[PDB]
Amino acid sequence: GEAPNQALLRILKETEFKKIKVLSSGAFGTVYKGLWIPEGEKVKIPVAIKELREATSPKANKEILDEAYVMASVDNPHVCRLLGICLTSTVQLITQLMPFGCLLDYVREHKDNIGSQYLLNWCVQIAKGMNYLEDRRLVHRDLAARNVLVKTPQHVKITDFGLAKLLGAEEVPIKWMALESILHRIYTHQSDVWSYGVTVWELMTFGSKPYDGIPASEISSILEKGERLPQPPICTIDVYMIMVKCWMIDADSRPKFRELIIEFSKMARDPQRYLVIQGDERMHLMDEEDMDDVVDADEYLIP
Numbered sequence: 001g002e003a004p005n006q007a008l009l010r011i012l013k014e015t016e017f018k019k020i021k022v023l024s025s026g027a028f029g030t031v032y033k034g035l036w037i038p039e040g041e042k043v044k045i046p047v048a049i050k051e052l053r054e055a056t057s058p059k060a061n062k063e064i065l066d067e068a069y070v071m072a073s074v075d076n077p078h079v080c081r082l083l084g085i086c087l088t089s090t091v092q093l094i095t096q097l098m099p100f101g102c103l104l105d106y107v108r109e110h111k112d113n114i115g116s117q118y119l120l121n122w123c124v125q126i127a128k129g130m131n132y133l134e135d136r137r138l139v140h141r142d143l144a145a146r147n148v149l150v151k152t153p154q155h156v157k158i159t160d161f162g163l164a165k166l167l168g169a170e171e172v173p174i175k176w177m178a179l180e181s182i183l184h185r186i187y188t189h190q191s192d193v194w195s196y197g198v199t200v201w202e203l204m205t206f207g208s209k210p211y212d213g214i215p216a217s218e219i220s221s222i223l224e225k226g227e228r229l230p231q232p233p234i235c236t237i238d239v240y241m242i243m244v245k246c247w248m249i250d251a252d253s254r255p256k257f258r259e260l261i262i263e264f265s266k267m268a269r270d271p272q273r274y275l276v277i278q279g280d281e282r283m284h285l286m287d288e289e290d291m292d293d294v295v296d297a298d299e300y301l302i303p
């Protein structure tokens with residue numbers, strides 16, 4: 001049936017780490033850069049720390065603990081795992097630092113150094129991330145370039161679980177949503193696939209905004225006439241096709257993340273055959289204190 005989720009949730013002392021600089025405020029809370037010393041181990045760990053709005057109403061603490069629950073429950077080279085939490089007064093989520101920031105921001109800002117190799121690779125890595133989540137019977141409900149972060153240029157991870165679900169239970173980025181989603185609040189993994197397609201489109205179009213201008217209450221309408229996003233100017237038919245396959249109405253006609261890994265993977269073997277980028281093959285894509293004992297979190301594991 002369903003297995004016992006034996007994830008260990010780590011409680012971190014507020015003494016165990018320094019904050020170091022803001023990364024993102026406004027929205028629904030701060031996120032800081034920071035260092036972490038898992039006391040009694042003598043190792044520094046660059047981290048990020050999502051702290052909830054200082055206005056620590058009970059209506060919110062629920063939502064951030066939900067994240068924590070999920071983030072604590074995953075483990076994949078392409079899925080941001082929770083390092084631990086911290087109980088001050090507002091709950092602090094402590095995850096591994098994704099220094100290069102979110103993928104959207106990245107491709108927008110490096111438009112000119114992004115080769116097919118990179119684009120095609122992130123496609124693989126996200127399909128990988130997402131496939132895992134499928135295995136762990138999870139629905140994300142917010143796959144989006146803004147929600148994929150960057151460890152290195154050749155390492156992206158899926159993040160932001162503020163919206164996740166086990167598939168079939170009960171508990172708005174409209175322009176990223178499957179149809180059954182907008183008209184019926186239905187959410188399969190195959191709806192996540194649609195956002196995948198959209199996320200690919202974001203990347204292939206160097207961070208363009210899907211359905212730009214076009215007001216949202218109208219998306220249900222357009223989509224229902226059978227209209228989708230345009231081939232990005234760099235996309236061979238083969239890439240563009242695979243995007244369009246995620247946008248089929250009948251959702252089992254969408255492809256599965258597992259096949260998505262395979263095709264893209266195939267393609268990332270001969271990248272210039274599949275994306276046509278100007279001067280492609282000529283492209284190629286942070287401290288203080290000690291740093292002697294600095295280790296990245298992916299190399300920090302307790303049983």
Ligand SMILES: COc1cc2ncnc(Nc3ccc(F)c(Cl)c3)c2cc1OCCCN1CCOCC1
Pocket residue numbers: 023024031047048049050067071093094095096097098099100101102105149159160161
């Ligand atoms: C250095 O860049 C980041 C690394 C990150 N590393 C790990 N996690 C991040 N966010 C995050 C996401 C979910 C979580 F539960 C937690 Cl604890 C943290 C990170 C967010 C980061 O920045 C997010 C991008 C902020 N932009 C900056 C410009 O204004 C709009 C939003």
